[PDB]
Design a protein that fits this description.
part of a larger assembly, 3 chains, A: mainly alpha, two-stranded antiparallel ribbon, 50 helices, globular, C: little secondary structure, 0% helix, Transcription-associated protein (chain B), TBP-associated factor 12 (chain C), transcription, Transcriptional co-activator
Chain lengths: 1012, 968, 45
């Protein structure tokens, strides 16, 4: 659907441009913000790719100068840390967003630098996005200057000319790329060979190059000659991990890889008497690459029964070495890729192998205490600890997944996990620090919950205030010096942990950080401000607005920066600038609202300044800077000359100018939360916009995307918070609504139908006393039955339910007999709760009587078309709610009462609602009961015999379903059926005259032919 | 590749046998069943998947042929190798048309690289040259043509001379000339051609051609037999130098007589009127096409379109089918881009300006100006070649020519005058001021001012420099005459006060280091008056920051008021350039607290974040973790203020301070490596670009550390002047000494990483595995894939001559093998602890012990190591007084340390001008004397051959020290 | 700025295999210095 929508603006350089244009600023930023917190984050990057492709050579793209330095540093920071999820080259989607940003190269492209390292990923390993990579390289050679462009590419000039030289090849290769590359290497003339230098990356016999020598036996050479059994190891690794080749090569690549691996394993000399012993450099990076492809072979079908068979072998093998080296490690570096992999099968085999290094270790020694003194269980602790301090993102995921199982399988000696308490948590704060905010949050969600659940786990034992000497307080002194800093996920969890640390071992939180609270303050007071740029200046406030949320802390001398604050308030980087002033509110709002400190300061004119600046910020140029400022004024309510000074700038913005923006309107709505003449003033404000020559020009434009409508609805929002007098603004405000819909030609919906309703929530009595008087009119009462059906009028539905039967009296007392209005009213509040319908019955027949009165006048050919669609859709609405009553009771004799009451109209009742409701009474000793009631009600021959016939759809489908799902009539009525119809007399059916009565007599003949 | 089916025929002979090997009571019995009875691998399931792998990748078949065919040949017994060789030679002659693979690791490449792995067969050398050049595997052919030449002798002169000719046109094809000119003079027999070959790889082509015409008259009824080859050198390198010298009318009449492409080349470019003789003579030679001959075919199709004789579309087709032939010659070359490719990178610029001039004079019968300026900038380097500079001027002249002919407010081109003047300037920049001469008022006065300055005309040059200053370089040249006057007059000359204020008038008006080295010495010339300090306040801030360790010493001495004025300039502007250097000195020491206080008031955050890096390095200081002992540094880059540059960037040049790499994060590995001094703690800093920078803090720093920073500083002055010239930048001879920034009086860091294993570390590596030929044994088992081995050796010997020059000049004492660091992936060689003293103490002239002299190769010892030591001296003697100008202020801090060395006091203050003037006179007479003798009778070098003959003499080698390790 | 040309179409020109050989060990070995401009494609044996 995004493909269908974004290709439309490529079809129209027209009025189909300004409707998409403001939304794509949100649709990009909310796709970056959702990709870090999604289950499959790649569809949020497929979305922007069809946005960037669907435009090109466009109109201006003037709204991309602001999102570009945050979109590049998102893409370059996860083109590094991404290594092919399923196997899709998902690093080759990030480069195609990075290289095809749809802007001009002149001023926007400068600062592209970010584009030099994804330039070489597009040229080297790609197939037809090479042509995208050469196209941007041709643009930046001839346009730019050599004094500017040459210092940019110096880190990757030696790497782009190796990938440019793989494209110069003759006519079997492309004539497209090989001729484009020659033009790039010619259009810069002497700067070709200015990089040609002595080489440095001479491959000095690397790990897969390692000539391992297996001793063979050949027939000519009569000895044991050694040969290198690794000439295909480079092609074994690249065949096993590609889905493109056939499966037979991929299975043979494993038999090669496991074939070399079993020659390293079994060549080790085993012990002569290991049971008696129990009573008493370049290989080790080759084996990790070998054992990793064994772990990847678990994810392959039809061979995982064999690859698992030696994975359990080698993990058993590598623990008896260390238990024989007690008189005197490639599995751990191979486990951490299995833990950090992508497929669930290889990940679970990482989880099965960490158990087997313990489940066999308890089988060998037995005593778990001596199996932690020198055992390999102790060293896989510090492997999981250390690899949280790694550079790449995926190795942080291994130490966070490996640790959370290493605390749910070693559960028994938790005394071991108290000496390593601080070293785990310091390792688990660090993973919150050097993780980018644009990476997916699976490494931080398992790190946030692991500090929280562990301190509830191994700190449920500490006694009292006396034992707080050195060991526990150093833990507290670690997570309070990490309170003031940026990257708020390490700042929010330093408060969530310290709360639950002091929840158990019940100690006041102020007394817990008490002997080290002066060590925290001293950096935060020393340098006051104007250093420590705006990322840090949110962190300096955050440690103090938490500290005054304690029971008591630092009752003196925060006023050295309390001036400093007011003035930072009194004056992307624009994102953090409004993030800066939104936290100085919370520091100032907690300065006055807390008692026993406002009386302490009150001798040198402090609170006044705070209040005054809190104002001047009320007319700010943003929206969310007003909302927290609104929370500060609503907290200090529990002066008047300053209120008149504040109302002076408020009434100046409230002047009759017809130019009031929506920022001042919500600030006005925030002001009335804390005279009535503005209602006379604001009606004439909207009527300047509400002339019909401002709405007929609108005509058919969409209302939600429009901007002049948002000024209209924000005006209507203020009427929720009026003065509480008995308002005479009921009639003219709703007359302003009906006038606003007819000139828009828009019925049944509008965006300004919602704020009209919250006004009606305020006045339930004055609303219904307006509606009940003008009830026979159609066009205003249609808005009523939407307002009752709204969930926001919870106080209006309580009025109309209590005052229900006074509108029933209207139907007793001639073209304005509005049966049709009452039906939609009762339908609207029956959809509110399914419990209202169960007691009303004299209502429901009184609707159908006066409806059947209206179907006498409406069945008259005197005028041409009196079939008004309000009346006939009254019946199709009445009937589907008359069935909503029926499936609340279990009685099978009420459905045969709806029949005779509709004899003047429509014959068989309405389809799609009742023919599948009889089919749920047909489809038990109550099926015998319905056939008693039919033979009771049918000899009422005055019931208009098309209803008497109508039991052909309700009598016989019972029996022909009984005689199909059961054997033959295995299951009262027969004693009563034979009583009347087979002792029948002359006037009824036992006469003989060819009329329409014979259509009923076939219900009698076709039933007896089924009883026999 | 049919080697896949040749493998399975060879794999069938493998006896696929069951042993393959390399060479609580219930649990132990369970595994012991597994690890030996289920391990038990037969030879089948190794080789059977190897078949199924090799059907996919063409590199496995090349990788498996080279390991099984020498096993196969070793069972071909005696009396059948000659039967095998002739049956193999017959296979390589079996053309399958072109034996048309011509693709990646094909049959010929994998067959020729499998021959060299087995000794005993010796394929004919002109077939190896043909198979290696035509298909691929050039370096698979030099493995065979050097194995036959060196090592044993083949016991036949006619197989040994046909090998050398087959070798010398492999080196010519790959355009390494230093191995070409060193294999020839190892071979050639006359004296007149061993002189002319060596005057020609230096590059003076006037004494090269004289020694060729005086070589042939040694023949022609001379008694000497002169050989068949060495006569293809005389008659072809007479005409090589005669077209380097640009004598194009003499070799016109020469090529009139024989008649070939040389007539088409010189008479052609040096076409609208003589098109008909030129066009038909092209088509006689246009068959068997080459990338050169299509440029003649295209250009006359372009100047036929100019006269309307030829249609446009044809030039597009002629440029299209000609580029696809240029593509095929690029694909026949090796993978790594070397000097063998530069001939094709100039063909590329011909084709771009041939499809560009096909639209400049298509729309001819304000776009022209854009094309003109793009063209005025698309020029090769100043060091490139004097031929391929000339092959660009010719083209451009032709083109602008047509535009001028057709344009018949200023319509005048005057652009042919630009490409001539640009070529006339680079013709003097190379060598030989004769090729340039045959083709705005103060400069005429500066020429007459310099003409009076050569003779003894003081008032005439002063009036001319005043005439030039009244109308740039003369503002410093007049004081340079006064600097020449002050050295000529007595010690009370006052013109130096009129000189140091003169060079600062245009010091703000690049090469500012050549005057700042002259400024910072005459201020210390016993200024008891100090009148130049007022002259310093009469009226260049970056270019002092290289001279910082000289500046911070002069604060304790005199002129302390003015040298304070130039460090308050730097620290206000560049804080990172000075904070580490002033912290190493901690009013003999009291004035720098005002400099420190200036460093802290301005930039309050940078001085705070930097000291938090120093003290964490100061407190604590196979693999260890940074997490345990230095956890403040893992938390550094979260609280890291704004930016911190990686240290050791202000020592070098790059004078604009924009693209210096800043610290991103510290990698958590402390890769301590048992070094030769003991062990140190190598950290690793990750840069902005992903480039990791491994440093190495060392715990002590002995009292030479404030002297060896001044030694490396001197070759920060030579190394950029080494890269500016032509015969030194053509060969890329970077002096490669490392950065070493000090952080404290005790702790200094310096840049070193893995693969810097020193020469003694090679020696204990061999005895751990337990003569001569120990570098030749260690570097062949380490470097398989001979393309890597040949390039590493060639870069080793080219860097060893840069080790010899800095050891000979400014004489370093006994270089033990543990004092000389060799790279293992690049070959860059540098020395630690350079302490010069500057007289002959007890020495052989340099270290050339025969465990190196075998690895050099005895044909790069003549062609690289003997001429790179010359071409370093041939530029440093004559750039701008590198042996005189800079060397004053770098000995006046040596002789004040020598007086503190030999005793405690110091004397000879008035004589201190003469102790500097003597020990600079040795260092200007140690560089200059080993340059080439200007007569034509010497070979070309003859003094660096005099010193190499001394350093390899086994008398002069063992007579010296015994801990010097003169056997390895 | 500059406005650039474009590649036309897949047009196939194949080369051919000439017949001679050469031995001569000097740098020019033909009419001039560089060799990959003055060497005949791929030669026949």
């Amino acid at each position: 659907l995004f493909k269908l929508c974004f290709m439309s603006v490529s079809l129209f350089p027209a009025a189909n441009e300004s409707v998409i244009l403001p939304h794509l600023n949100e649709l990009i930023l909310k796709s970056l913000k959702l990709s870090t917190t999604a289950k499959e984050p790649l569809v949020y990057f497929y979305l922007i790719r069809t946005l960037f492709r669907s435009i090109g050579g466009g109109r201006f793209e003037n709204l991309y100068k602001e999102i570009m330095p945050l979109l590049q540093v998102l893409l370059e920071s996860l083109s590094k840390l991404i290594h092919e999820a399923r196997r899709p080259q998902e690093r080759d989607i990030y480069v195609e967003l990075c290289l095809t940003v749809p802007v001009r190269l002149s001023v926007l492209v400068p600062h592209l630098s970010y584009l030099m390292k994804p330039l070489v990923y597009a040229l080297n390993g790609s197939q037809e996005s090479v042509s995208q990579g050469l196209r941007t390289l041709e643009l930046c050679v001839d346009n730019l200057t050599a004094e500017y462009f040459d210092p940019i590419i110096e880190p990757v000039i030696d790497d782009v000319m190796e990938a440019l030289s793989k494209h110069l090849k003759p006519l079997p290769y492309y004539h497209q790329h090989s001729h484009t590359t020659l033009r790039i290497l010619g259009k810069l003339g002497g700067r070709n060979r200015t990089f040609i230098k002595p080489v440095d990356n001479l491959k000095t016999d690397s790990e897969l190059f390692q000539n391992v020598e297996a001793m063979f036996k050949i027939h000519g050479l009569p000895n044991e000659v050694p040969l290198s059994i690794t000439p295909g190891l480079s092609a074994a690794f690249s065949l096993l991990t590609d889905p493109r080749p056939r499966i037979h090569y991929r299975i043979n690549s494993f038999k090669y890889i496991s074939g070399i691996f079993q020659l390293f394993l079994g060549a080790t000399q085993l012990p002569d008497d290991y049971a008696n012993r129990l009573k008493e450099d370049s290989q080790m990076e080759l084996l990790v690459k070998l054992l990793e492809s064994i772990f990847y072979a678990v994810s392959l079908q039809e061979v995982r029964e064999e690859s698992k068979a030696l994975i359990r072998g080698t993990c058993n093998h590598f623990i008896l070495l260390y238990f024989n080296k007690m008189v005197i490690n490639c599995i751990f570096d191979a486990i951490i890729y299995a833990l950090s992999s992508d497929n669930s099968a290889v990940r679970s085999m990482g989880l099965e192998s960490v158990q087997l290094i313990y489940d066999s270790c308890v089988e060998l020694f037995g005593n778990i205490d001596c199996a932690l003194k020198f055992a390999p269980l102790n060293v896989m602790c510090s492997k999981f600890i250390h690899c949280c301090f790694e550079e790449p993102y995926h190795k942080k995921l291994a130490g966070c997944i490996g640790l959370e199982m290493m605390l749910n399988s070693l559960d028994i000696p938790m005394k071991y996990f108290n000496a390593r308490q601080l070293e785990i948590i310091r390792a688990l704060f660090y993973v919150l620090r050097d993780t980018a905010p644009e990476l997916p949050c699976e490494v931080t969600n398992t790190a946030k919950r692991l500090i929280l659940n562990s301190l509830k786990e191994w700190n449920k034992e500490l006694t009292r205030n006396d034992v707080f000497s050195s060991v526990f307080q150093n833990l507290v002194s670690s997570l309070i010096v990490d309170l003031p800093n940026a990257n708020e996920i390490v700042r929010a969890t330093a408060q969530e942990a310290l709360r639950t640390l002091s929840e158990t071992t019940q100690v006041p939180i102020a007394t817990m950080i008490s002997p080290c609270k002066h060590i925290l303050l001293a950096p935060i007071f020393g340098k006051p401000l104007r250093a420590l740029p705006f990322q840090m200046q949110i962190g300096n406030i955050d440690a103090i607005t938490f500290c005054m949320g304690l029971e008591n802390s630092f009752l003196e001398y925060n006023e050295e920066l309390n001036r400093l604050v007011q003035e930072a308030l009194a004056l992307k980087t624009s994102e953090q600038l409004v993030r800066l002033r939104v936290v100085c509110i919370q520091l100032l709002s907690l300065a006055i609202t807390k008692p026993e400190f406002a009386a302490a300061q009150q001798r040198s004119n402090i609170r006044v300044k705070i209040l005054v600046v809190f104002f001047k910020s009320l007319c700010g140029r943003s929206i969310e800077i007003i909302r927290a400022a609104h929370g500060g004024l609503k907290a200090v309510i529990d002066p008047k000359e300053l209120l008149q000074n504040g109302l002076r700038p408020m009434l100046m913005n409230l002047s009759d100018h017809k130019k009031l923006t929506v920022a001042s309107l919500e600030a006005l709505s925030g002001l009335l939360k804390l005279k009535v003449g503005i209602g006379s003033k604001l009606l004439d404000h909207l009527l300047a916009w509400a002339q019909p020559r401002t709405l007929q020009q609108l005509g058919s434009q969409d209302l939600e995307n429009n901007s002049t409508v948002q000024i209209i609805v924000a005006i209507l929002d203020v009427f929720h918070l009026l003065p509480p007098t008995a308002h005479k603004f009921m009639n003219d405000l709703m007359n302003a609504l009906l006038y606003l819909e007819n000139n828009l030609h828009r019925c049944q919906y509008s965006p300004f139908r919602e704020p009209l309703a919250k006004f009606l929530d305020r006045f339930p009595d004055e609303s219904f006393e307006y509606f009940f008087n003008e009830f026979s009119k159609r066009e205003i009462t249609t808005r009523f039955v939407y307002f009752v059906g709204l969930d926001s009028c919870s106080s209006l539905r309580a009025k109309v339910l209590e005052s229900l039967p006074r509108v029933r009296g209207l139907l007793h007392q001639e073209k304005c007999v509005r049966f049709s209005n009452l039906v939609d009213l009762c339908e609207s509040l029956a959809a509110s709760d399914k419990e209202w319908i169960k007691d009303k019955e004299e209502l429901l027949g009184e609707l159908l009587d006066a409806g059947s009165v209206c179907l006498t006048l409406k069945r008259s050919s005197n005028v041409v078309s009196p079939l008004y669609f309000q009346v006939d859709q009254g019946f199709e609405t009445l009937q589907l709610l008359y069935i909503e009553y029926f499936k609340s009771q279990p009685l099978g004799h009420e459905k045969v009462f709806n029949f005779i009451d509709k004899i003047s109209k429509e014959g068989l009742p309405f389809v799609l609602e009742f023919d599948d409701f009889i089919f749920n009474e047909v489809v038990i000793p109550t099926v015998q009961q319905t056939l008693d009631t039919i033979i009771r009600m049918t000899p009422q021959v005055s019931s208009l015999d098309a209803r008497v016939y109508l039991y052909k759809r309700i009598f016989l489908p019972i029996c022909i379903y009984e005689s199909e799902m059961h054997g033959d009539l295995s299951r009262a009525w027969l004693k009563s059926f034979d009583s009347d119809v087979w002792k029948a007399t002359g006037p009824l059916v036992d006469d003989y005259t060819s009329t329409l009565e014979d259509r009923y007599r076939l219900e009698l003949m076709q039933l007896t032919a089924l009883l026999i | 590749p049919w080697l896949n089916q040749a493998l399975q025929l060879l794999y069938g002979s493998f006896h696929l046998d069951s042993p393959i090997r390399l060479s609580i009571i219930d649990f132990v019995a369970k595994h012991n069943e597994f690890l030996d009875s289920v391990r038990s691998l037969t030879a089948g399931d190794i080789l059977n998947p190897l078949i199924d792998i090799s059907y996919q990748s063409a590199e496995t078949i090349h990788n498996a042929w080279v390991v099984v065919f020498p096993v196969a040949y070793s069972a071909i017994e005696s009396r059948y190798e000659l039967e095998f060789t002739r049956a193999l030679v017959k296979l390589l002659f079996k053309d399958y048309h072109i034996r048309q693979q011509d693709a990646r690791p094909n049959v010929i490449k994998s067959l020729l690289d499998g021959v060299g792995k087995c000794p005993g067969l010796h394929l004919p050398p002109h077939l190896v040259k043909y198979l290696g050049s035509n298909y691929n595997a050039w370096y698979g052919a030099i493995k065979l043509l050097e194995e036959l030449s060196e090592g044993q002798g083949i016991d036949n002169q006619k197989i040994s001379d046909a090998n050398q000719d087959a070798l010398l046109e492999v080196y010519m094809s790959l355009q390494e000339d230093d191995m070409f000119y060193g294999t020839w003079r190892r071979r050639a027999k006359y004296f007149e051609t061993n002189a002319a070959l060596s005057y020609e790889q230096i590059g003076i082509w006037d004494k090269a051609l004289q020694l060729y015409e005086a070589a042939q008259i040694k023949a022609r009824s001379g008694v000497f037999p002169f050989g068949e080859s060495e006569y293809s050198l005389w008659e072809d390198h007479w005409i090589y130098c005669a077209e380097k010298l640009q004598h194009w009318e003499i070799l016109t009449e020469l090529a009139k007589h024989e008649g070939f492409t040389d007539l088409l080349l010189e008479c052609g470019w040096r076409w609208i009127a003589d098109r008909e003789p030129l066009e038909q003579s092209v088509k006689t030679v246009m068959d068997i096409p080459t990338p050169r001959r299509q440029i003649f075919q295209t250009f006359l199709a372009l100047q036929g379109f100019s006269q309307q004789k030829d249609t446009l579309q044809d030039v597009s087709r002629l440029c299209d089918e000609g580029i696809q032939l240029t593509l095929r010659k690029w694909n026949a070359l090796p993978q790594r881009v070397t000097r063998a490719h530069i001939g094709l990178l100039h063909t590329f610029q011909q084709y771009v300006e041939l499809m560009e001039a096909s639209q400049v004079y298509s729309s001819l019968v304000q776009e022209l100006k854009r094309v003109l300026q793009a063209w005025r900038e698309r020029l090769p380097n100043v060091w490139d070649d004097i031929n391929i500079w000339n092959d660009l001027v010719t083209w451009r002249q032709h083109v602008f020519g047509v535009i001028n002919r057709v344009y018949m407010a200023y319509r005048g081109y005057h652009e042919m005058a630009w490409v001539i003047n640009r070529f006339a300037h680079v013709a003097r920049k190379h060598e030989m001021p004769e090729v340039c001469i045959n083709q705005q008022k103060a400069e005429f006065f500066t020429l007459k001012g310099m003409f009076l300055a050569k003779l003894n005309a003081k008032d005439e040059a002063n009036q001319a420099f005043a005439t030039a200053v009244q109308i740039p370089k003369a503002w410093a040249e007049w004081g340079f005459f006064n600097d020449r006057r002050f050295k000529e007059n007595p010690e009370e000359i006052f013109h130096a006060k009129n000189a140091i204020s003169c060079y600062l008038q245009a010091a703000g008006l690049g090469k500012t280091r050549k005057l700042l080295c002259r400024i910072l010495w005459l201020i210390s010339l016993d200024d008891a008056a100090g009148s130049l300090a007022k002259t310093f306040e009469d009226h260049p801030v970056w270019y002092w920051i290289t001279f910082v360790p000289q500046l911070l010493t002069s604060l304790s001495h005199k002129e302390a008021k003015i040298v304070r004025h130039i460090l308050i300039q730097i620290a206000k502007s560049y804080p990172q350039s000075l904070h580490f250097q002033l912290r190493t000195t901690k009013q003999p020491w009291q004035d720098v607290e005002e400099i420190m206080g200036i460093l802290k008031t301005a930039y309050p955050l940078l001085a705070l974040s930097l000291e938090s890096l120093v003290d964490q390095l100061n407190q604590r200081f196979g693999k260890a973790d940074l997490e345990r002992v230095s956890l403040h540094l893992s938390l550094f880059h979260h609280q890291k203020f704004e930016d911190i540059e990686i240290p050791g960037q202000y020592l070098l040049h790059k004078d604009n301070n924009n693209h210096f790499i800043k610290i991103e994060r510290f990698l958590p590995t402390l890769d301590l490596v048992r070094g030769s001094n003991g062990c140190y703690k190598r950290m690793t800093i990750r840069g902005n670009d992903g480039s990791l920078h491994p440093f190495a803090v060392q715990f002590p720093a002995a009292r030479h550390c404030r002297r060896e920073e001044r030694i490396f500083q001197l070759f920060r002055i030579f190394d950029d002047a080494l890269s500016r010239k032509v015969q030194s930048r053509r060969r890329n001879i970077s002096l490669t000494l490392p950065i070493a920034v000090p952080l404290s009086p005790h702790i200094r860091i310096l840049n070193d990483d893995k693969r810097y294993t020193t020469l003694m570390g090679i020696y204990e590596e061999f005895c751990r595995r337990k003569p001569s030929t120990l570098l030749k044994d260690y570097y062949t088992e380490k470097f398989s894939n001979y393309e890597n081995y040949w390039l590493f050796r060639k870069q080793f010997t080219a860097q060893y001559a840069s080790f010899i020059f800095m050891t000979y000049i400014m004489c370093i004492n006994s270089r033990q093998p543990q004092k000389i660091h060799i790279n293992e992936g690049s070959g860059n060689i540098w020395t630690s602890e350079m302490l010069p003293t500057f007289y002959n103490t007890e020495s052989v002239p340099f270290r050339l012990t025969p465990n190196i002299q075998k690895f050099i190769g005895e044909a790069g010892l003549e062609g690289i190591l003997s001429v790179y030591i010359l071409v370093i001296a041939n530029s440093l003697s004559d750039s701008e007084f590198d042996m005189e100008q800079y060397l004053s202020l770098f000995v006046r801090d040596e002789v004040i340390s020598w007086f503190a060395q030999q005793h405690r006091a110091s004397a000879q203050t008035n004589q201190l001008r003469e102790i500097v003037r003597v020990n600079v006179e040795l260092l200007t007479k140690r560089v200059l004397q080993l340059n080439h003798i200007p007569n034509s009778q010497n070979v070309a070098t003859q003094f660096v051959l005099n010193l190499i003959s001394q350093a390899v003499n086994p008398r002069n080698l063992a007579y010296t020290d015994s801990a010097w390790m003169a056997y390895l | 700025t500059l406005i650039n040309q474009h590649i036309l179409k897949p047009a196939p020109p194949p080369t051919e295999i000439p017949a001679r050989l050469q031995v001569k060990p000097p740098q020019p070995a033909a009419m001039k210095i560089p060799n990959r401009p003055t060497l005949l494609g791929g030669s026949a044996i």
